Amino acid sequence: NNVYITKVSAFMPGNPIDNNTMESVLGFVGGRPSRSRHIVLRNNGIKYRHYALDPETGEATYTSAQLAAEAVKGLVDEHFSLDDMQSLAASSGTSDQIIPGHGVMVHGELKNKPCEVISTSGACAAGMTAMKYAYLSVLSGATSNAVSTTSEVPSTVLHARNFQSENEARVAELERRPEIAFEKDFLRWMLSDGAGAALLENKPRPDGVSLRIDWIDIYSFANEQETCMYSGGEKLADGSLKGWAQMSQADWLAYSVFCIKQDVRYLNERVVKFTLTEPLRRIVADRNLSSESIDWFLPHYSSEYFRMKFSEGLDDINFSIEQERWFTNLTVKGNTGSASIYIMLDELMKSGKLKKDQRLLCFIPESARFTGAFMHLTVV
Amino acid sequence: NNVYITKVSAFMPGNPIDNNTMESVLGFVGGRPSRSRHIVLRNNGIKYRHYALDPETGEATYTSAQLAAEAVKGLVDEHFSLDDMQSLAASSGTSDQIIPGHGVMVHGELKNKPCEVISTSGACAAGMTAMKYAYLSVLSGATSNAVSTTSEVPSTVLHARNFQSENEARVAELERRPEIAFEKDFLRWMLSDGAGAALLENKPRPDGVSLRIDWIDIYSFANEQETCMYSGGEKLADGSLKGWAQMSQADWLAYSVFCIKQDVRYLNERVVKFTLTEPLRRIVADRNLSSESIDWFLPHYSSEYFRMKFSEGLDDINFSIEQERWFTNLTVKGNTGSASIYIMLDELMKSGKLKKDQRLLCFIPESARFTGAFMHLTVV
């Protein structure tokens, strides 16, 4: 009983948007430009990204459910139609609503016949917990195929309108040039929109390359790490997170409780050890891994600032992988959060660089409260 | 390989609250008592329920993460300790925050050692997609045990404070009737708080009874049914759902965008067909089931009004099951959403009424956008 990725699909809304255009798309808070955009862009290295926003009108061009539906429809070919789907697992850190779950909204867009639909939640790793669900479904024999998909439209919550009531509130407290906290403004030049999907099957395709999933290992370090990326709440001085419904309605607006925030200094101190080295050293030992066997390393490292910090982490645990074997399109596609690993896998599989028997290691960290997800693939 | 539920656990916050006491815990909107509470209670037949709310001082007694952690802790005994957990799958229709996912917040409360943590999302069926993830983990051989847990604290969003800006906006608009619509007040007398947890293992336990999971089948009918229960958005005239981030910040408050709403006429028209009869007649045909072979039917039917309507649905597909084989504790535990099936299973496994070889059919509908989840169990 084996599981193979036989088709991957990526969908980026609209056109690539360069560093000089992006602020006009995401808007000015309180009539003024962002103070730190320039150095955020310099540190993260990202040069283009996509937003599900109309360039001329600023209207939304895709809900999160539509974006995911577009990616799933990219899996359809002569070997697979939507109605063949035996199980659909979907996630989005930026779901359009709180209830219903994201997956049934995607099913509503796809309109394929009644089938099993699962939603996973969280952030960067949620696309990988959806993929592991789909993997387990086929591996166990519950189904002979499954589809996982994830989508991200943080443009919905990064646009300047998401901070207007906060700006107006500080103007009623008479401050002259109020600026939103860096913990809020920072993610606005980091996160962008994208969606991916994967078809998993219990036999490889007759022609072309398939990727056998050998395993998917996931570890949470929330038992001792604090929340680090959060929305729908506010992080307290003691490190705990206060949920939005424990705050007053007035405060939701005055503090932008529903925008995405990052405890940047805490991230910087702990992301490498508690998303990479602590889980990977466990997995290396338990599975008897050799870094020399890995032909392709696909890391979602979010920001050029962390590329070599993660590489140092691999060194510290005797699992060095030279930059020549690292594959990523972060700089050109954007940090699409949970979709990043799908947008990487999509390009590598369609590139023609893969060779039979080659081995792939996928690393998907989630700084939200420090999860590391890892997947080992073998080309067949 | 096989999967056994070897322990179930349930946690109700606080003391049972009766029909006369409940509105003082949940509050008046705009100083006036609710006009619909009496008939909603008349129709749902519920007499007790629990809220994670201090009844003297009104403050929260458990977050959703804490409520689930209390349930997971109920699983611990001489045969299982928290650190033996190879996988945790958690869900909540009322997560404390949007990011991170509910599961890693549960882990942060439990503080057990690093392990795999997965979150599922949605409403009533999300407890069962979480359980099916745990079941597939053990069925596939990925792990030898797994824990699923779900928690509900709708009290956080049903309290009167969640409607106070809309009341003010309706007073300010000079509405002849300033009360909030039935579609927003209805669920305040329907939904209540509770959590459950289940331990799944690849061998039964020697002492006492175990429940072998024969299968879990799930169907979504969102391909043709509109959204029906929803929060963090609003239903448009054309039946689509507009997500909260597409609405102005002022409208979030003016219209209570983040409260839980239900389209009651659409619910009443469609919930029996598209959560019970359409999925179950598929399951019955595919697995060649006979209603005569089921010793215990455990249905989450939410309201007395629907008990015989679901029973009628069984008749329509020639799967009649008479009331003496139904097991529920709704009237005395409340409608706890996704937790309901855990709270039914907890009582039944502890009642001593289960005999070896008896067969259980669990039915968990989700009206949110019409999913039916079904689980078949055999006492060993």
Side-chain angles (χ1 to χ4, degrees):
Chain A
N1 256 29
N2 285 284
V3 193
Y4 307 84
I5 308 181
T6 58
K7 192 106 184 180
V8 181
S9 180
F11 188 83
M12 323 294 301
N15 293 319
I17 299 178
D18 53 32
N19 292 12
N20 290 329
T21 314
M22 71 189 297
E23 190 171 32
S24 68
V25 173
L26 294 183
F28 287 0
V29 174
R32 326 200 69 153
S34 178
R35 246 165 149 156
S36 42
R37 173 184 72 85
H38 171 81
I39 186 180
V40 176
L41 287 172
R42 173 148 56 70
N43 284 325
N44 66 35
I46 304 174
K47 288 161 168 260
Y48 303 88
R49 75 279 303 154
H50 292 253
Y51 301 121
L53 290 160
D54 180 88
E56 314 201 298
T57 73
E59 267 116 295
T61 47
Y62 303 90
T63 66
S64 190
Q66 290 171 326
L67 210 69
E70 286 312 315
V72 179
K73 292 187 293 188
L75 303 167
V76 168
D77 65 12
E78 74 272 4
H79 307 301
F80 177 82
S81 74
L82 300 175
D83 275 5
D84 297 335
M85 205 188 307
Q86 296 170 24
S87 176
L88 170 66
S91 50
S92 173
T94 48
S95 284
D96 307 299
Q97 64 292 300
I98 289 179
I99 289 175
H102 173 64
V104 308
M105 308 304 284
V106 170
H107 188 207
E109 285 295 331
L110 288 171
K111 275 158 166 135
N112 54 297
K113 75 178 187 181
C115 69
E116 173 171 287
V117 174
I118 262 59
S119 303
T120 66
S121 59
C124 297
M128 279 314 306
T129 67
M131 200 185 280
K132 183 160 186 184
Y133 180 93
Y135 163 71
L136 294 179
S137 190
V138 183
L139 184 73
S140 69
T143 60
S144 58
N145 69 39
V147 171
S148 73
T149 182
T150 191
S151 61
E152 292 298 346
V153 285
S155 62
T156 57
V157 293
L158 297 179
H159 186 283
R161 75 204 178 216
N162 287 277
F163 311 92
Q164 247 29 251
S165 308
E166 170 168 354
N167 189 266
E168 303 172 356
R170 290 154 83 174
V171 157
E173 293 173 348
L174 296 183
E175 169 50 350
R176 290 187 180 176
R177 185 192 294 162
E179 291 172 14
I180 61 172
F182 179 77
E183 284 150 328
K184 300 167 181 175
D185 188 82
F186 152 88
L187 286 177
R188 309 185 59 221
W189 323 111
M190 306 265 332
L191 302 186
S192 58
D193 302 5
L199 176 61
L200 277 66
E201 289 180 292
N202 66 2
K203 306 160 182 186
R205 284 291 171 79
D207 300 323
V209 303
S210 305
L211 311 188
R212 192 184 65 217
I213 303 166
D214 303 296
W215 40 267
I216 305 170
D217 286 356
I218 306 179
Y219 281 93
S220 163
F221 296 82
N223 57 302
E224 290 303 310
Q225 306 311 307
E226 283 167 16
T227 297
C228 173
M229 201 191 87
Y230 49 102
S231 74
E234 202 85 84
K235 183 172 184 187
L236 296 190
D238 68 4
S240 68
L241 187 75
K242 186 201 273 263
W244 61 267
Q246 297 304 118
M247 290 162 248
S248 76
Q249 288 182 317
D251 284 356
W252 305 345
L253 265 34
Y255 301 109
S256 309
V257 168
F258 291 107
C259 80
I260 314 185
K261 292 148 293 252
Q262 178 113 67
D263 189 342
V264 176
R265 293 182 305 269
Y266 197 91
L267 168 81
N268 183 264
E269 186 177 297
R270 291 160 190 262
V271 74
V272 164
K273 176 171 182 182
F274 290 98
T275 63
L276 180 55
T277 63
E278 283 304 292
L280 188 53
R281 76 166 169 79
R282 233 150 303 213
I283 295 154
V284 167
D286 290 355
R287 297 201 183 264
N288 250 280
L289 293 196
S290 284
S291 80
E292 298 176 340
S293 70
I294 308 311
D295 299 289
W296 298 97
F297 183 55
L298 310 219
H300 164 51
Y301 60 77
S302 285
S303 164
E304 213 58 50
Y305 180 104
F306 288 101
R307 174 168 54 85
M308 293 313 286
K309 302 238 280 197
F310 280 122
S311 193
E312 273 189 49
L314 290 181
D315 299 329
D316 298 344
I317 60 149
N318 306 330
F319 212 81
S320 300
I321 306 178
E322 77 248 12
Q323 286 291 304
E324 286 64 46
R325 290 183 281 130
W326 290 36
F327 181 92
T328 182
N329 46 19
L330 164 63
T331 286
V332 156
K333 300 280 184 191
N335 174 358
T336 52
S338 63
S340 298
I341 192 52
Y342 289 75
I343 291 158
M344 281 181 268
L345 267 178
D346 171 77
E347 181 177 316
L348 186 60
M349 207 167 322
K350 286 163 197 194
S351 72
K353 308 170 187 195
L354 291 183
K355 300 196 181 100
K356 290 171 190 165
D357 302 311
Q358 269 177 343
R359 299 185 180 181
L360 296 72
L361 179 56
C362 302
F363 163 51
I364 303 83
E366 169 174 289
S367 66
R369 201 162 175 177
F370 298 95
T371 278
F374 296 82
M375 175 173 65
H376 192 281
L377 312 163
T378 296
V379 191
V380 306
Chain B
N1 277 258
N2 295 284
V3 188
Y4 303 90
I5 299 174
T6 62
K7 200 118 154 71
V8 177
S9 173
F11 182 83
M12 316 306 110
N15 295 319
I17 297 180
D18 61 40
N19 291 11
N20 295 326
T21 317
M22 85 195 277
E23 184 173 26
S24 69
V25 178
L26 285 184
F28 292 165
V29 171
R32 293 236 274 282
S34 172
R35 301 175 300 157
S36 298
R37 179 194 60 94
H38 182 80
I39 186 58
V40 171
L41 285 175
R42 172 81 192 194
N43 284 340
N44 70 31
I46 302 166
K47 291 175 169 178
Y48 297 99
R49 76 238 81 207
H50 293 255
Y51 303 117
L53 285 176
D54 184 305
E56 77 192 90
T57 170
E59 54 181 355
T61 47
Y62 304 88
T63 71
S64 195
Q66 290 170 329
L67 207 72
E70 288 303 308
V72 177
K73 279 187 287 179
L75 296 179
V76 166
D77 65 9
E78 28 284 351
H79 301 104
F80 182 71
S81 83
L82 291 184
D83 284 6
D84 300 343
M85 205 178 297
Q86 295 165 35
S87 180
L88 177 73
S91 55
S92 177
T94 50
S95 298
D96 299 309
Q97 64 287 291
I98 298 185
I99 285 161
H102 179 60
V104 303
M105 309 305 285
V106 175
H107 190 203
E109 286 296 336
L110 286 167
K111 304 205 129 245
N112 54 296
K113 74 125 170 310
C115 64
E116 155 179 298
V117 168
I118 262 70
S119 303
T120 65
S121 54
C124 306
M128 290 301 311
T129 67
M131 203 182 287
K132 183 165 189 179
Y133 179 99
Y135 160 74
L136 296 176
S137 184
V138 182
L139 180 57
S140 66
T143 60
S144 49
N145 71 53
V147 174
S148 69
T149 181
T150 190
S151 61
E152 294 296 335
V153 282
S155 64
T156 60
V157 291
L158 305 172
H159 187 280
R161 70 206 183 209
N162 291 278
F163 310 92
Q164 234 50 247
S165 299
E166 172 163 0
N167 173 252
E168 296 171 15
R170 287 185 71 76
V171 164
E173 189 75 35
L174 319 160
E175 287 293 346
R176 228 189 56 95
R177 314 243 32 85
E179 291 87 2
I180 60 174
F182 183 76
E183 306 244 289
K184 299 174 188 180
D185 189 67
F186 170 65
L187 291 174
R188 309 177 64 221
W189 322 111
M190 297 281 340
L191 310 179
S192 65
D193 301 10
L199 174 62
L200 282 51
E201 299 186 273
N202 64 359
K203 61 189 132 63
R205 231 130 76 151
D207 39 314
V209 289
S210 294
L211 303 178
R212 190 186 64 213
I213 298 169
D214 305 305
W215 43 262
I216 304 168
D217 292 351
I218 309 186
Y219 281 98
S220 166
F221 292 86
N223 60 298
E224 296 297 321
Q225 310 306 304
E226 296 169 7
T227 301
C228 178
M229 192 183 91
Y230 51 98
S231 72
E234 91 184 351
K235 192 173 175 177
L236 306 191
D238 68 354
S240 63
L241 192 67
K242 186 181 205 197
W244 62 268
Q246 296 306 124
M247 307 181 187
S248 70
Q249 290 183 317
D251 284 350
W252 301 347
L253 270 52
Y255 298 112
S256 305
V257 175
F258 296 98
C259 80
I260 313 180
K261 286 141 277 193
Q262 180 132 55
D263 186 341
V264 175
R265 298 189 70 258
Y266 202 86
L267 171 72
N268 293 343
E269 193 197 0
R270 282 165 194 253
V271 72
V272 173
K273 186 168 183 199
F274 293 100
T275 75
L276 181 53
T277 62
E278 284 300 299
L280 187 52
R281 78 180 171 76
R282 264 161 261 243
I283 295 165
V284 163
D286 286 349
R287 294 185 183 279
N288 191 36
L289 304 183
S290 295
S291 76
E292 291 91 346
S293 323
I294 277 90
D295 306 288
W296 299 96
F297 186 54
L298 278 61
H300 164 56
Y301 62 83
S302 291
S303 170
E304 166 67 11
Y305 178 91
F306 283 106
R307 179 174 54 91
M308 292 313 296
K309 299 197 148 75
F310 282 122
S311 181
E312 241 120 70
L314 299 183
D315 303 332
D316 286 350
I317 63 164
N318 309 117
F319 210 76
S320 298
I321 306 187
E322 80 282 348
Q323 289 296 300
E324 304 93 88
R325 279 184 284 151
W326 293 34
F327 180 85
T328 187
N329 49 18
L330 165 74
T331 300
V332 143
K333 304 291 189 179
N335 172 7
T336 63
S338 62
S340 299
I341 187 74
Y342 290 74
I343 294 165
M344 271 172 255
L345 272 182
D346 173 79
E347 184 167 315
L348 187 46
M349 230 166 312
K350 272 155 187 167
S351 71
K353 306 183 203 168
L354 293 176
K355 303 306 159 198
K356 303 192 178 172
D357 304 330
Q358 282 187 324
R359 301 175 177 217
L360 302 71
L361 182 60
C362 307
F363 164 49
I364 305 85
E366 172 178 287
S367 58
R369 198 166 179 182
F370 305 94
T371 285
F374 298 85
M375 179 170 57
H376 189 287
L377 314 170
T378 300
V379 185
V380 303

